């Protein structure tokens, strides 16, 4: 059966160049709808580019048939890319996950460096001579 998408409590927000609203979805006879599908259908209704649309926070009603979530649409792809959190941009494929080392290893490195005064090019020579 047809999915029906409705938007509620629409607020325009010039301070962050976006519109923000509640998303309410009817979907009889299917489990739910993917965030990827919602972003495409919201893009055409608000005349936006797909990369400017962000959608999050869904739960489906007990007994099924309905879901509710939250949505944002930005005035441009450039503005979305600066105000949006990085973790969401990764979900959409607009950014790459950074390869930092684990939290405990980073802390242990810091504490070793605290024991060296200066830049340590000296001392390295001194140990080699010992």
């Amino acid at each position: 059966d047809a999915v029906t998408i409705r938007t509620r409590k629409v607020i325009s927000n010039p301070l962050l160049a976006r519109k923000q609203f509640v998303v309410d979805v009817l979907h009889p006879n299917r489990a739910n709808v993917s965030k990827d599908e919602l972003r495409e259908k919201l893009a055409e209704v608000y005349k936006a580019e797909k990369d400017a649309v962000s959608v999050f926070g869904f739960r489906t009603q007990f007994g099924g048939g309905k879901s509710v979530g939250f949505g944002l649409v930005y005035n441009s792809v450039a503005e979305a890319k600066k105000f949006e959190p990085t973790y969401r941009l990764v979900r959409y494929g607009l950014a790459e996950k950074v390869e930092k080392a684990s939290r405990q290893q980073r802390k242990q490195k810091k504490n070793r460096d605290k024991k060296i005064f200066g830049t340590g090019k000296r001392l390295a020579k001194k140990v080699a001579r010992r």
Binding site: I11, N13, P14, L15, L16, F83, P85
Partner: protein, 260 residues
């Protein structure tokens, strides 16, 4: 403690902010500034919880650092800057102005004002004295010091201040028959007219107030703020005009009228 404290646990926050119990362990501690901690409203609480323009503390900072917000005509960027009673807040995008004023329930209301009224604020006179070289000055409730007041100004009077320049333009004497706004205690947010004042030397003076439904009540002089003549406010009043209703009256109005 060995010095000043930097944190504020939730539950210890002022109740009129209407923070929920469970969303976190801490609350925003207001910075030092014009208004006392217990009776200020931090900007983060205004933008996030009242207007809903921001979802997070992180987003609030993204707004302020663009310099979109100014208080009494000056740009502020401290997340916990303490706005307070009678202050003017301006958002230039969206083109909106607000004055912070109390509900009859004793909460800060969202009250919009015209671009004209945003020019000025009222101030209660806290003391008047001679400064160095013999120059007189007044101190207002929000901590401004103004040089060379009119010789007739006395304590408990109210003064009209132009936000540009900062000079005094008018004043109203404390007297019987004036309108007053109540700013503390059990009767916070009510409006009425002065009936008479009780002198108590070495103690607290008491003031008798009557509202337009001719109910009467009493408050300490410390809590009284003069705002105009009988029936002529110097500022726009919030919806409901400071008339207190009994819980029975409130129940009827909602379900009978608005509840259709």
């Amino acid at each position: 403690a060995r010095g000043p404290k930097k944190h504020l646990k939730r539950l210890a926050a002022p109740h009129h902010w209407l923070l929920d119990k469970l969303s976190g362990c801490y609350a925003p501690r207001p910075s030092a500034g014009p208004h006392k901690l217990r009776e200020s409203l931090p900007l983060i609480v205004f933008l996030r919880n009242r207007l809903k323009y921001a979802l997070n503390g992180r987003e609030v900072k993204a707004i302020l650092m663009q310099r979109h917000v100014k208080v009494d005509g000056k740009v502020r960027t401290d997340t916990t800057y303490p706005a307070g009673f009678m202050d003017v807040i301006t958002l230039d995008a969206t083109n909106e102005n607000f004055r912070l004023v109390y509900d009859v329930k004793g909460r800060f209301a969202v009250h919009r004002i015209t671009d004209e009224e945003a020019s000025y604020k009222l101030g209660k006179v806290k003391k008047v004295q001679l400064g160095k070289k013999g120059v007189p000055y007044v101190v207002t409730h929000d901590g401004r010091t103004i040089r060379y007041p009119d010789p007739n100004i006395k304590v408990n009077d109210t003064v009209k201040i132009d936000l540009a320049s900062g000079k005094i333009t008018d004043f109203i004497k404390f007297d019987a028959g004036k309108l007053v706004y109540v700013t503390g205690g059990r009767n916070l947010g009510r409006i009425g007219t002065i009936v008479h004042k009780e002198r108590h030397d070495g103690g607290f003076d008491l003031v008798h107030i009557k509202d337009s439904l001719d109910n009467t009540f009493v408050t300490r002089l410390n809590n009284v703020f003069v705002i105009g003549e009988q029936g002529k406010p110097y500022i726009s009043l919030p919806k409901g005009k400071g008339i207190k209703l009994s819980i029975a009256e409130e129940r009827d109005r909602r379900r009978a009228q608005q509840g259709l």
